């Protein structure tokens, strides 16, 4: 009380007011945009949703006593908002419920009274007119309730708040959907609630009911219109299958599902990581590494997000598999710098033909290699080491004997030296030929590029692609 | 007061980082420790070499009586005599500043520099203050304040001067040779070497000759390199003074690879006795090794290693594994053959190399324009 009690009056009063005016003016701005000019493509629905991800999760984490988050439910318990005097009667109440809470105390939450703070706010003459207002005011208690992590009759209060909000979501898409279109708001609320519906299960069990409900919501979607609804519901259906053992259900999912080319640079980073993980495991490597690259160079405007740490983590693993030497010292950035020691030590022994060190690196860091999720190297790196040595010789030399390469690769068998290079040419490691007479392994023809149409094939991929950059940039720029 | 200080930091570096080299570095620096009133910057030299020795309290009361005499001198100057700007007050303040550099730590010196820098309205005094930061910034290898005062000199001071700046042309290349920037910028500004008298502003002239000649072979291969290192006059005399360096250039120019093999090893054992050779011991060798191979593999497309057994040096299998490490490095565009003993090169014809230069600079720009194109459009 002498030390921290003086710092108790300054935190409530001004952030209680300035946050409430922002969400009410935007909530009033969402109202006028819902009432007229529903073309809200560049409107404040996005930036307010960009606020609700960032600010409300890093500013407040508890229910904010002296009536800041706990006081919004007795503030919003008495709302009708139907007729123009009835709204102005409620507009009289908006000033009065803030003035009493701003002066004095009104109604306190003691972490148990969530049932009077969720039914009577849904009740007491509420309507269907202000649907994002009812959508946000039901989703705003979802953040501090999970973030408290107290676990004393809290899961069923989460479970009731989900099933209520999911019942409110069905009543919007089916009943009176004329010019409301809250899908830009209701998608991320569906994403954030399922994260909590998974993690709270993941404290205790699995999740199967969350996905059978997710197949139904995707079934009743996908027929109307695809505007980031089908995009975000796809990855939630795909992240769980990648979380468990099965890959076949994800494989048939990624097979036939066309895309709306509209996900606002937030799902494109995520999805191109998942399908790059899928094409890695069914051994389609060249298409995998380029779309693993495409997600990484998409949005580098993140500070230790973990995702940029993870898509970078798999990208150096797969470029070892193609023998395409992922950058031997460029991947120490100030962002990660610590998730490279199990991998800079890995690519060291992969580069040389050493195995006793490579077995030492693998056995020492095997606990790390299982935890992160890339323990699919155990079968795929013994192939890489034995093909790295024959690739280095075929790149350096031009005409080597089979006895000379068999002693160079510490193999001690000049009878399967023909077998290694036969598998090298069959797998496409190097283009060469073996003369089965006395051990002639010759290289290719004299390299001529500029005289056999090869600059045309590279340039034709460039012309048609960069005019497509132009045609996409023309059909985005003009607005009223 | 800051003149015999480039040798001290050599002797501090020579004793500290190698442990085998500890015979003579303790013998003469301990003479420089008891001299010079070196009483703040020696505890890193004292704890890491010897245990302790009692000469400490004697010089501390001498430097305290010297400080308190200089404490009472300039306060009596400012309280009795009234002049501002650049006056008897000013050169007494830099006499305190040159006391804190030679004797004291850097922390008293840096706060006296910033104090007297706003007590200046001329430019030559401000030029000398930035001379003082840049001289102590090289003494204590600070890569932090050199990012400021070099810009503050070139943009706010070095516009009224007239050839009073060649010294910090030599200081910036000294920071460039020690950081990494020893490719083409170091050899460019080391081309003009017209300074013979050595002073506060200049280092040892003999070591400046060795530094300007080790770098003048990496920037330019032979676009008339012989005009600027052989047809010179002031550089030709001082390399005529030294037998090894004059042997080192002639071995590279007349392509005596058997003794250029030896002359590179004599330089490299000499490289350990330096105070800035850290990105040199592992990078200057392999660059000069791959430069000797590259001009040797010119003018020959059917070269044999049976001729390499006597022309370049000796040995057979060492050159084979040496060339194999560099072909697999990505460099030295040539092929090697074992059972025919023909090192057949495949150097491009100034088209296929130029074809690579469009496709490497092209997609590097293309990945830049898409990453630009996705940050925008929400």
């Amino acid at each position: 009380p002498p030390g921290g009690g003086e710092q108790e009056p300054p935190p409530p009063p001004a952030p209680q007011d300035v946050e409430m005016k922002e969400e009410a003016a935007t909530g009033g701005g969402s109202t006028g945009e819902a009432d007229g000019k529903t073309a809200a493509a560049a409107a404040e629905h996005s930036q307010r949703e960009l606020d609700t991800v960032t600010l409300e999760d890093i500013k407040e984490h508890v229910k904010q006593l002296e009536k800041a988050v706990s006081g919004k439910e007795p503030r919003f318990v008495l709302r009708a908002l139907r007729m123009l005097p009835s709204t102005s009667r409620r507009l009289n109440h908006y000033v009065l419920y803030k003035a009493v809470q701003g002066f004095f105390t009104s109604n306190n939450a003691t972490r148990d009274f969530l049932l009077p703070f969720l039914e009577e706010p849904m009740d007491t003459e509420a309507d269907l007119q202000f649907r994002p207002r009812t959508g946000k005011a039901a989703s705003t208690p979802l953040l501090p309730e999970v973030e408290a992590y107290l676990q004393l009759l809290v899961v069923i209060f989460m479970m009731n708040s989900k099933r209520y909000k999911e019942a409110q979501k069905i009543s919007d898409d089916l009943m009176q959907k004329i010019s409301t279109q809250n899908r830009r708001a209701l998608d991320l609320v569906a994403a954030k609630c399922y994260y909590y519906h998974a993690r709270v299960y993941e404290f205790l069990d699995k999740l199967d009911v969350v996905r059978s409900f997710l197949h139904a919501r995707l079934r009743t979607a996908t027929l109307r219109h695809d505007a980031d609804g089908q995009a975000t519901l796809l990855n939630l259906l795909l992240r769980n299958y990648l979380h468990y053992s099965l890959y076949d259900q994800a494989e048939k999912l990624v097979s036939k599902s066309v895309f709306p080319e509209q996900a606002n640079n937030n799902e494109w980073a995520r999805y191109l990581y998942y399908t790059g993980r899928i094409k890695a495991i069914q051994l389609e490597y060249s298409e995998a590494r380029r779309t693993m690259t495409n997600a990484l160079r998409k949005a580098p405007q993140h500070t230790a997000v973990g995702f940029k740490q993870t898509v970078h983590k798999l990208l150096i693993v797969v470029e070892l598999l193609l023998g395409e030497i992922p950058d031997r010292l460029q991947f120490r950035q100030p962002s990660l710098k610590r998730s490279l020691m199990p991998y800079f030590l890995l690519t060291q022994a992969v580069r040389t033909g050493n195995l006793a060190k490579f077995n030492q690196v693998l056995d020492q860091f095997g606990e790390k290699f299982q935890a992160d999720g890339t323990y699919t190297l155990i079968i795929r790196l013994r192939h890489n080491v034995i093909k790295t040595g024959v690739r280095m010789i075929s790149l350096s030399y031009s005409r080597i004997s089979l006895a000379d390469i068999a002693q160079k690769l510490q193999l001690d068998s000049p009878e399967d030296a023909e077998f290694i290079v036969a598998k090298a040419i069959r797998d496409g490691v190097i283009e060469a030929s073996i003369n089965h007479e006395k051990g002639y392994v010759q290289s290719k023809e004299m390299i001529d590029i500029y005289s056999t149409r090869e600059p045309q094939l590279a340039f034709h991929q460039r012309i048609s692609f960069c005019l497509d950059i132009h045609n996409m940039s023309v059909k985005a720029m003009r607005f009223p | 007061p800051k003149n015999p200080d480039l040798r001290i930091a050599q002797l501090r570096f020579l004793l500290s980082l190698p442990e085998h080299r500890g015979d003579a570095a303790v013998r003469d620096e301990l003479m420089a420790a008891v001299r010079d009133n070196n009483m703040a910057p020696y505890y890193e030299a004292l704890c890491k070499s010897l245990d302790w020795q009692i000469d400490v309290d004697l010089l501390n009361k001498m430097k305290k009586a010297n400080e308190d005499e200089l404490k009472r001198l300039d306060e009596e100057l400012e309280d009795a005599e009234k002049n501002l700007g650049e006056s008897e007050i000013r050169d007494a303040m830099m006499a305190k500043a040159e006391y804190l550099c030679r004797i004291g730590d850097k922390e008293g010196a840096l706060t006296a520099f910033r104090k007297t820098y706003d007590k200046t309205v001329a430019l030559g005094h401000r030029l000398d203050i930035v001379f003082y930061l840049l001289r102590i910034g090289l003494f204590y290898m600070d890569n932090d304040l050199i990012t400021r005062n070099t810009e503050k000199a070139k943009s706010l001071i070095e516009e009224g001067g007239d050839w009073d700046r060649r010294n910090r042309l030599k200081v910036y290349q000294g920071l460039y040779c020690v950081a990494i920037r020893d490719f083409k910028q170091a050899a460019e500004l080391f081309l003009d070497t017209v300074s013979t008298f050595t002073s506060y502003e200049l280092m040892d002239y003999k070591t400046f000759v060795t530094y300007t000649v080790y770098v003048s072979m990496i920037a330019l291969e032979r676009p008339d390199l012989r005009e600027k290192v052989i047809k010179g006059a002031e550089i030709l005399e001082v390399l005529h003074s030294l037998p090894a360096v004059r042997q080192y250039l002639f071995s590279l120019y007349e392509c005596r690879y058997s003794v250029f093999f030896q002359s590179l090893a004599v330089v490299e054992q000499e490289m350990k006795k330096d105070w800035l050779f850290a990105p040199h011991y592992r990078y200057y060798v392999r660059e000069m090794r791959i430069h000797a191979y590259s001009q040797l593999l010119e003018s020959y497309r059917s070269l044999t290693l049976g001729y390499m057994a006597e022309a370049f040096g000796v040995g057979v299998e060492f050159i084979d594994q040496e060339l194999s490490r560099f072909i697999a490095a990505g460099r030295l565009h040539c092929k090697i053959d074992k059972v025919n003993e023909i090192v057949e090169t495949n150097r491009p014809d100034s088209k296929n190399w130029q074809y690579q230069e469009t496709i490497k600079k092209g997609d590097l720009l293309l990945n830049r324009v898409q990453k630009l194109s996705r940050v925008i459009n929400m």
Binding site: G29, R462, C466, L467, H470, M477 | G362, L365, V369, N377
Partner: peptide, 30 residues
């Protein structure tokens, strides 16, 4: 191949200047 490079930077710059002028007239009209 320059026409692929240059003309893509032309219309991209015209996209940036419109998307700056769009959102700034939008954020200051209300």
């Amino acid at each position: 191949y320059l026409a692929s490079l240059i003309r893509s930077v032309v219309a991209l710059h015209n996209l940036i200047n419109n998307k700056i002028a769009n959102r700034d007239a939008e954020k200051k009209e209300g």
